[PDB]
């Protein structure tokens, strides 16, 4: 990998273990639920994404 | 913003010890006083030895070590003598030292004990504590028939911070908060701990109730003397010496401030 050993650390791969349903639920951006967008993004972003 | 007004109550006073209570002072002052009793009250002790003959079984540094530990009566003379650093003489003079000689030969089939009585001084107010007019004399060495010890010594002013031979105390008892009202110590099982002699608790109570407002304000001392100084002279010398250290510091501080 070309890396020095002192500068690396333990991390978890978030996509390896989840089921297909949990993977989709966690990682697929839902651009269709307007109220969830309105709770997560400011208005001009919700208008653009929709 | 200002000084304490401490109070003193002497509860026992003997030739060997003084027991007293200081009240309305700070713990730091009480501890620095305790420290000065040990480290910074000056007395006279043998610090230079020359051996002319030593046929004893103990080597010369052993004899000299033992002589250095013999306590010498210091009371009014040690305030008069200079330190050898401050004195103007080339090496020794009556203004900064007391001369001693010892000369013992065993000529008998009985073992000769050589003692602090065989030390002879040139100054009649600076003598070994055991030689003052009971407690026996300090044993220096034992001589077999035909063995000899002959030496000359000078005693110098010094204080226990330089060497323990100049410590005048034989133990400093110090205590505060005898019933653990301040909880500075915390006992896991208070019922196991024996009462202080200064306790005011009844025998069914292991420690006083916690005082959230108190701080150390009463201190119990037992200052025991090795005999070179009277116990009260240990205390008064310590208070004078600590006051002098502070005055010297203020003189240097005021020069430093004027230099800035």
């Amino acid at each position: 990998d070309g890396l020095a050993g002192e500068s690396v650390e333990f991390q978890n791969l978030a996509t390896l273990k989840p089921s297909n349903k949990a993977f989709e639920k966690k990682f697929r951006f839902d651009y269709t639920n307007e109220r969830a967008l309105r709770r997560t993004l400011q208005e001009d972003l919700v208008k653009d994404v929709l | 913003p200002y000084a304490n007004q401490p109070t003193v109550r002497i509860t026992e006073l003997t030739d060997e010890n003084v027991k007293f209570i200081i009240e309305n002072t700070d713990l730091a002052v009480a501890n620095s006083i305790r420290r000065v009793f040990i480290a910074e009250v000056p007395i006279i002790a043998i610090d230079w030895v020359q051996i002319d003959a030593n046929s004893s079984v103990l080597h010369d540094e052993f004899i000299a070590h033992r002589l250095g530990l013999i306590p010498l009566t210091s009371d009014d003379i040690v305030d008069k003598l200079q330190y050898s650093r401050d004195c103007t003489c080339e090496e020794f003079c009556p203004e900064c030292s007391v001369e001693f000689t010892l000369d013992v030969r065993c000529n008998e089939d009985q073992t000769r004990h050589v003692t602090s009585r065989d030390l002879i001084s040139n100054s009649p107010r600076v003598i070994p504590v055991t030689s003052r007019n009971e407690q026996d004399d300090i044993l220096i060495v034992k001589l077999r028939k035909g063995q000899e010890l002959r030496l000359r010594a000078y005693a110098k002013k010094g204080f226990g911070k330089e060497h323990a031979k100049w410590n005048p105390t034989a133990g400093v008892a110090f205590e505060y908060d005898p019933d653990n009202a301040l909880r500075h110590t915390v006992y896991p099982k208070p019922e196991e701990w024996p009462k202080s002699e200064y306790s005011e608790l009844d025998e069914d109570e292991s420690q006083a109730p916690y005082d959230p407002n108190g701080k150390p304000e009463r201190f119990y001392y037992n200052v025991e003397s090795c005999g070179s100084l009277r116990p009260e002279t240990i205390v008064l010398s310590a208070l004078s010496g600590l006051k002098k250290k502070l005055s010297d510091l203020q003189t240097q501080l005021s020069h430093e401030i004027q230099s800035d």
């Binding site: - | 913003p1 000084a3 002497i10 006073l13 730091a28 330089e162 205390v235 510091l249 800035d260």
Partner: protein, 115 residues
């Protein structure tokens, strides 16, 4: 071999200053007092008397290394006051306390010796 002479704990070397004052630059009204050939005996009393002064905002001391023979005292004051003035006043208060304790001990001894 490398034993220091025991008097080096309390005698100044030639040209050694007893006390040096430096400004603490990182906060106002603050000084470091470096005192040579002194120990906990003076540091702890000076620090504790300074904490009795309501115009002192910080007082602390350290022995930087127990084989060295110097103490650092840090003081900070309110801006109407001075850490040099606090340190001088503290020493004056201690001297007065010890003079009063000395006189009262002489009296207690005299009373104990003759009822």
């Amino acid at each position: 071999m490398n034993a220091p002479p025991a008097f080096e704990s309390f005698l100044l070397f030639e040209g050694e200053k007893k006390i040096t004052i430096n400004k603490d630059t990182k906060v106002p009204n603050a000084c470091l007092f470096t005192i040579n050939k002194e120990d906990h005996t003076l540091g702890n009393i000076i620090k504790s008397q300074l904490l009795k002064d309501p115009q002192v905002l910080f007082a602390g001391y350290k022995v930087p290394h127990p084989l060295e023979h110097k103490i650092i005292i840090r003081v900070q004051t309110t801006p109407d006051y001075s850490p040099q003035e606090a340190f001088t006043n503290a020493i004056t208060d201690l001297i007065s306390e010890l003079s009063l304790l000395e006189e009262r001990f002489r009296v207690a001894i005299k009373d104990k010796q003759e009822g």
